[model samples]
Target chain A: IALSEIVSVVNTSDGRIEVFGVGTDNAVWHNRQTAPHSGSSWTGWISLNGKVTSKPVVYINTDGRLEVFARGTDNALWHIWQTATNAGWSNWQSLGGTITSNPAVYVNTDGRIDVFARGTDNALWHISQTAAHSGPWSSWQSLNGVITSNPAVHINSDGRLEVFARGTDNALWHIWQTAPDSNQWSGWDSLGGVITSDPVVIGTADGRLEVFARGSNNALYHIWQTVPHGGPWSNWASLNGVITSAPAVVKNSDGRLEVFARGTNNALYHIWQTVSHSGPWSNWATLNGTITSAPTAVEDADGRLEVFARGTDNALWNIWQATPSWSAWVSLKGSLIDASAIK
Target chain B: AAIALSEIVSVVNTSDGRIEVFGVGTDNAVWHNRQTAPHSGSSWTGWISLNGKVTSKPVVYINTDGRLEVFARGTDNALWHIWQTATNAGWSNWQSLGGTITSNPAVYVNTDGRIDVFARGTDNALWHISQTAAHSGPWSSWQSLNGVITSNPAVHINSDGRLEVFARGTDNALWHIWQTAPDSNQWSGWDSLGGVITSDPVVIGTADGRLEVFARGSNNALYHIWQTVPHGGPWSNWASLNGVITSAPAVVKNSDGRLEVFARGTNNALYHIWQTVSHSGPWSNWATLNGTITSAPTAVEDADGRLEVFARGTDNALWNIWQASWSAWVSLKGSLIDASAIK
Candidate 1:
């Protein structure tokens, strides 16, 4: 009983892949590669010692410092940061909000980081660094809506941060910055469709924002902007297959997006675009390993897409692309995680 | 396009003798089909969508007053349920009974008529909740029964009126916990029944009041154990009824009290074995009722005493066979399985 069910990944400027997870102790703990991109080596977990309810999320500062945030035991947003580039970590600090979900953070074009979470009132609430790469923070701000899942944010190519979440009615809804780097955001817009999981979004090679979610039927569904930025989203289109986890996507070196999710049978499955920023996509295919949580993927320094998941034995398991093909799943074997998939 | 149904089904006989069926559709929402006429299978009410996204197979049981209630693991990992307002009537809206459960909910009625639900919690331990009184009473908060289980729960009311639950423990053995005494809130600490179980357990009481439990053994064959005597007697050692089974066994008692077991065979066809006589005798050899099945087979004895079996076919739709002897499989062209049907 020492970890949450899911692990969150964020790569540091030094090229090390760090993971943030909630310890069963309700405190946030982390583990990272001992050497940059060293798939086989890792520093054991270090506790950040703040009582948390779910997985913690991290964002890297322009100067290479890493900042992490989580919903505290008391239901407030809490944080900790690396004192220097991959140097040492700091003590937990409350960001102050009665947040009800995991925090989502995105660094703005100006380099300031903004954190978003579901508020106690069920509305979307956020706070940001008042100055780029510095300590002062803005008070919590509410961008109202009754959200049912954690907020997922993606920075558009235009440098505008777009937010996605499942609303009270279980439909996908969104709000975005009025313009690149603007402090103002458009009112919540309904990109309506019954969704069962938190929405995860990615920027298409063409610069369009595409969002994926577990639909009402537990199938993977997506809606994307017909045009980049402010354009209206297309109606939800399904990539039908019975999935049990929220979808996770990572862009291929070729620029096409490949999405992964836990199949109904608990195997890791994925589908990718046959052509980047284009219409055709591949059929869902299984990677054939029993995963207990949603798979988390990251583009390694070598440019290969490495995906991580908690295996049946509660150990960390990963399957990565080796050049043009994928490798067999290998276990990290520490039995280090618990089982929620972040959302 | 309309959502296709998956094969996770639950069948129950309404108080008025009509057969009501429930299944999760491809869209993750619960859907149902009921006999348009009581005790008849010639026609159904078609599919009625129940709006809520669920992650596990739905389980349905009748109240002492004959009203029906359905429980499932919602996408939030909490237990959510809907019930009929009156006997064989309209259903209440989805209601949340909070707890972070990791498996499908199993429900059974207490001797005095109150309902109790069992499930595997996030900690892999058994957890439970109960209605404070008989039908329509408020539910009590969840309580942990504490045993490391790895599968969904199977529950049955002992002839002596105590509620007993069986599940696949972390050790791959059949583990059980029962109420300390008939209708008591206290329990017997977890005990292993000693079997290398590979699938979730299914249990049923025989005509003589003895309880027998079936599960897929490590060798992928049907295995079972029975009470040496009715009610709270010592259990017999596990024994295999040799046949390569691909899913958990689903068993139902005949109108005359004989128990018939159903499962998906190695060739993806429906297969069965049963007590040669009404309650006990040498078991019949495995019998195949051919159809391209993709899920476990669920059988129910009709109000008139005939057996009706249902399953998800290769086309991802509902298929079944109904007869007193043997019959050809027919398609219901409906989706939903790990199915359950009770007369």
Candidate 2:
């Protein structure tokens, strides 16, 4: 949306979707899509009754409830969630933490979702759902180092949750759960590689976590654990294509990790490692279309890895690779009808 | 493909069915051009000195008598209209349309076969003046519609032969006034349909005799408001339709009478929304039609009913979006320049 501030989208397990973002009115809209792509559906938009300048995060609890969170205009964390079946979202609730970075979320080993973000002091802080996604969220807890970049979270092979972010000096930094669902966490460990773009974490078929970002020269670079869940990361490997933005990585339906990024020439470019996580990555292939925003991708329930991006024309555009093989990028006709045209 | 200019302010499809682009050139004079056949060849004509510089992109429209009329805000803040009837000549003489125009003017043929120009006056009010059918009478005395206008007004003839003017109010809400009969100098009372708006509204008739208004919302989202009985019925409740949009919307009816609304997203991509199975059916999901549109779009139907969209690209080139034989987006390239340079 063209609001002066920010906009974010979240998908719910039951197919309902929620969009939260700042509005031109300088307010927030926590809109919900009741029908999941049905021919005749409507999104009920209600002002969140506050203001936000960052993207919002949505996660489903073990009990199937959806929780929504955002950074308020005051830079504090605010949250709202739906509890009972068919219950509309609850009123805005303060999460009692000051935040400055956009938050990333992932499901924990115990089936609950945890959210991690950088605080005003640049420290990584997190809050977790006690009983699945429903809440009574744990009080904010600080992690080992200062985090200047937005962090990415993923579940590792042993079911341990890991957080990766960029340090103040531009080095790749990481931390992980000492044990699945345990309170103990590791201290800040530097990956020994420099990155200039936001990091993206993707879980391999063997449950290993791989982090990808943009290097100083705008090339795609990668650093990942040598072992399934532990070890010093491999030396940063530069990918084949030149990129102007951070890469978005996701596991395709074939269980292979695929990365997509905006090329220096403004077109969407992609490269993927096979499902076996073997040597020999595929050469970069142009998606044959242009994108204006860095893409966000997810493998939908249908096993299709769909990439969503804001097009250069200021509209949201999407392309997907369905199961079996990668197909041509199909511009989702009418996918960005709600976006504004003004800067 | 390489960067040329980052901004494009105005575009007009010429009488020869070739699209002409007009904007401030890199050297600050009025730049213009017409697209050639097969649509990819473009010849740059450079600039024309408007003695008084232009502060906004010039508006070009076919006058009621079939001559091309161009208007722009001069450095003196006054409005001027110029014409060129010959395909190969420079613009005919420039005529001062007289009042101070604070915003771009939208010119359209009224039911009476007169060229009417609507613009935001210095007082932030909607003002209008029209030339006589013979292009000889003094321009009509300017009339101010009592409403605070902050954006350029869009004028169109509704399905029932009424003249309507739509503009964004100072509060960013859409306000409109329409004349019940074709050439009536008086307009219906103004109506405020609440929603934060920033772009010009596009109006097109539905097969069922309704007029739909589409514009970019503050969040860069496209929103729609329509009336069934021409301007007599209560307007439909405003609907947030698609994409985070920033550019004004361009709407045209397909051969089948389906209304398609096109706009530039915040990322400068082209996005489209259309009604399927009837206006009541949920609007089709927005689809990204093309990439980085630097200027607002103008859409027209070819003799065959196929829609052709024209816009200025980031390269200051005129690019076209049309459904190829395979129904996919195919680019027709011709960079924007003056018509004289083409020969």
Candidate 3:
């Protein structure tokens, strides 16, 4: 049967975008592009079982297979994956943890997989592989923070990993793997943003991590490590786009960054920065879409960037940039009840 | 002989294709390492104590048209410089840069060979002084940055030739101010990278145009952060690599664009670690290079992609080590500098 929507889109490896979302018929559905652009090929809808409650997450595991995770109706973390390249998808397996947010996955250089979520208590809890990608996974560990949105994680160049979320007070809070290979974590530190959405972090071409979120004012705000890595953090700087949802950020072809989000008017909006960093950012530009959920964006190997959003019509719609111009929203037409996940 | 040398600075001297490393002698004379066949089977030719009594590390760099210039704080606590107008040209008489210094000097050269130097002012603020023109200078008068820095500033010129300076504040966090325009001393705000700093900070612009910062945290562990993106970032959070150290760490970009950092461990031995890939890849564990040292280590990559690090042995003698690939640490000899200490 034809699917209804697409929820997430991630550029996993070598220009491939694996998108995940929920079907109108109440199951999670998947589709992908051999490449992105108006002329790329698309895989048909493949439904994976779940009464999903949140956006799906798709990541290429460190062990060389694609995996998808989401929150089921029972609010438990459910995951499925491909056995081999072009292999069939596995049956949904409940990872046995209740959460209010989607699983945030991070695959380390050593092939270890870590998943973080907002537990029932609204605090961040996580579990990770004890060794390689094959898991006799470790017991769930608690990293306390009142998270309002799905957590986001990225590995540092120093072999460390950090996770961030929107705190109960509407500020950005974060924790990190403090010791290399120790799985020990740092305490939650406030990033001091008056944000209403999850914090999305990206590594700049210059080896610094910059984060963006939709502020309480419904505008996009950004902050970067002023000293590179964890030195003192700088004050929250404004990116100035009216976004209602968390943003999706990716480094564009020129090594500069472009951000996409659902604007306050429920249309997609974007802005970009110069390669010099320490910005003189471009003003808000509309991307002509009627989105009900957030957008996810990623850069392809061919130097193109694609963004996905779940439309009010409950289908996945996407837009790609060949460079300075954007493609018209192309419908991948699948039943999407929530947000789409893209790596 | 106990090394009375406190700190060391290096520059490639075109005269002999040797890296001339100079330090302030205990007796306050400026002295440097002489190299024989430096690019071949190189050997430290010995040390030469040039005539100058100084209070800080002797800074050295190549001038435009390939001359060599060295700067330091003289016994009078004013800026003083020594130079060669041509490769191995006869050494010039000591020239005073004329500033009342309160800290060690920081110097950087653009690919164009323009020079900029910074130091602490009598007011504890940072003072900047630069060449009016590349190698053709009536140098500019000192400019105060109005930043209350706690240590000697560390500076780097980006590939595009913009100046950036990092230092510590009395509050023990890292602070930064960068030039908004190329070669413009017109700077940005003092951005505070929040962490409890226990040592000075080090900065290096990587081959890819990113900035990496390393410092000893209050816990005495090596904490790192870098420009995660080529041109964007708040920086990743401070991540500890699980080793204790007592002094500020030194860092350099290897021939292949990986970062190599060297620091003295709590036990006084030279410790090393490096990113196997870009700043986001796994890092090698702390490897002790095997020798005691009383000062932080210093590193610089040679023209051929080889790496060398130097440290002061506890006996106060100097030690130099080098390695290429995942190769063995190679020990090299150092000829002693006259006068006593480095600082």
Candidate 4:
């Protein structure tokens, strides 16, 4: 059983820190740093009232408020938000969708929030606010695909949102908005790959989207858009490692990306481009962390990548790299299932 | 638009013998400046922006038709090219060759004038794309040479006209791959010429047409290997030039056919070593030009037999020292991005 829920960390509009997670009691619980950018001083866990069955993901609204979403006990999409910027929370509300995975939320160029999840029929489903921020939620709509994993999403430089997932055949599949901030879809396309883990996609510093997943051989594999913004996708290439978890990637201060994942040995390992904004990636280097869950990375204030994971002991552990060296894994001391962070 | 920082400048002599220099500006756009007359490095056309957000140093080569074709890693990390619409005239629009590259491309024209490009891919494998015909498009799709490489490729044409490439391999040693026949798409499997290196290999043609390769060795000193005889022959043992360098070695052949190698010394000043006689003599001890350059040097022999060296100086501008009478380093007056500091 999942002992501690997935943790989500984000910076408030005024730059304060807030983190949310599902508690052992199935309620969405959260904590806030005592001050902006504060690491050690935080308020204790506060319950947000929801029988969340999956990781709670947070999205900072265009209005500077925070909205949180997750799958509820009855397999429905549940959500809550800050009444105002850094203000009090709204009661948990059901968006009324029978979902099969954690929800992914994205804010459009025009500021509407759209949430995506896997429907009961193993197909992709999504819903959005009828208008930006202050509008009624639209009914759930199916994107139609036999996806077997939680969907991963990316925003193109042109402002359209693209979603990636592992199809029933274990191949990577994707769909996207035909235009910026639009509701119409371009239908689904299979990128084709034998992935063993849920895929994660990130927009590169150069505006291309690269998707990573664990291969059948437990090696981390990836494919990227052949051109920036939009183009044909490249063939799958393996990064060569015995990975046990989905990969986490964060862009370096100089625009290159660094990837981290839990190796089969349960240690956190990473690979990065030798130069900013380009590849070939360096050999995977170990951070010597025995993490139980997948890793999550975010750019720190100083531009270094700080990664968090649930250590084998199930307390939150983190490691960060600054230039030519890395900081040893430090305990953040929280019982977390997995972790996520904002830049 | 405001002038921004730039990367290293690449110099290639036009078919008509005029020198052209290209660089990636701070805004990531390709920019160029060229000599107004054959054999002249002075009184050039002002800098021209070719406009593309590139990530690596621009690489330029002349086509069979004398058109200058340039290639660089786009911000998307894909190989992109733009060529002279005509001999030494305006450039065509940027075209994506459609491969995910991680390094600045190495382009070499064959004896038949067909061009082949090589670069490390996101997978860290050496990948190539070549023109099906001389001076034109309808290029081949990306092909993998299948060796794990850690740096950009350095290529040289053998005396018999076959193309050979050298790069730092996964073991930090020198690895090479070569064309099975002159200008053929076929290539030999990767071969390792053992000697740990710290930087990309740079190859130069000997006076007698032998192939010699140099790289920053594990000790940060210059190490080199060469063909025992002019074209296809047994290789000599690795030799160290005995100077602590901070950058990859750059090499050129003089009018008298002596091979000269240049690198940034530990002091961040330009240092050079050369053969006492044409190709066959022992190399002289390292000599310094005493300018605080921030990047590796690019040396080119002029049409009139003089050798010119260009590098980025501490002020982030192009600086050069030409040898007719061995002149002092002079500022070329253009901004360049700050290089990795030696300290």
**Which candidate's TM-score is highest?**
4
Assess each prediction's global lDDT (C-alpha) against the native. Answer: 0.76, 0.63, 0.68, 0.74
Superposed Cα deviation of residue A168, candidate 2 (Å): 2.2
**DockQ of the candidate models in sequence:** 0.01, 0.01, 0.02, 0.01
lDDT of 2 by residue, A1-343 (tens): 1111123555454343444544445455655444433221335446655555556666655334566677776677777777542256788788778887777787764555788888877888998877534457899998858876778787775557888888878898888888666568998888867777778787654435788888877788887777656686789999857786668877654446788888877777889874234435788987756776677666542334556665656544556663354555543322222221111
* Chain A alone, TM-score per model: 0.93, 0.83, 0.90, 0.92
Model 4: how far residue A180 lies from native, Å? 0.5
Q: Provide candidate 1's TM-score on chain A.
A: 0.93
What's the TM for model 2?
0.45
**Model 4 bad stretches (over 4 Å):** A1-5, A32-44, A322-324, A337-343, B1-343
Q: List model 1 lDDT by residue over B270-311, tens digit each.
A: 888887743446789999888878777778865444678888
Off by over 4 Å in 3: A1-6, A12-14, A35-38, A275-279, A339-343, B1-343
Rank by TM-score, highest first: 4, 3, 1, 2
The recovered share of true contacts, given per candidate in order, is 0.00, 0.00, 0.00, 0.00
Candidate 1: CAPRI quality band: incorrect
Each model's TM-score, in the order given? 0.49, 0.45, 0.50, 0.51
Score residue B333 of candidate 2 by CA lDDT: 45
Question: What would you estimate as the lDDT of candidate 3?
Answer: 0.68
